[PDB]
RNA sequence: ACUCUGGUUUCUCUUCAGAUCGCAUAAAUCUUUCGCACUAAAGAUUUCCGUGGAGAGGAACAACUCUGAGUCCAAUUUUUUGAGGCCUUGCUUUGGCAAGGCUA
């Protein structure tokens, strides 16, 4: 609510080995942008290098 | 259903390739842009890793699979018959032709 008030005033008015976390994306107030569904494909089809039992 | 090409593999050389030439993805240089350039973008050039097409040469075994080419019908509907014979007129190329009327 607040801040899609605010994302809607926004819209209308040294060697690094690791990256800094400030670069992430996805830090998102609409909760169907956050919380995807996520595929089943019916329940057959799996995602690759994940553990097939978990 | 008979006969004559073309093979495949491998090594090397020549040329073209803006085609995801590569279902992958490096580096350098120059220019521009803004930052203030590994932690950044654009354009161009180059070098690398290594390709396809065609052509040429070498050398190893398969030679006709394939790609081609040259090489059983008499009974309605077609190719196993309704065929041939008589009469008039125009012209006879005096052989008969054309149309009609017929008999079978």
């Known amino acids: 609510?607040?801040?899609?008030l605010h994302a809607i005033k926004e819209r209308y008015l040294?060697?690094?080995?690791?990256?800094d976390a400030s670069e992430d994306t996805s830090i998102?107030?609409?909760?169907?942008?956050?919380?995807?569904?996520?595929?089943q494909l019916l329940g057959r089809g799996?995602?690759?290098g994940?553990?097939?039992?978990?």
């Open 1 to 4: 609510k607040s801040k899609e």
């Open 28 to 39: 998102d107030y609409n909760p169907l942008y956050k919380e995807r569904h996520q595929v």
């Open 14 to 19: 040294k060697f690094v080995f690791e990256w």
């Open 46 to 48: 799996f995602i690759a």
């Open 50 to 54: 994940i553990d097939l039992k978990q």
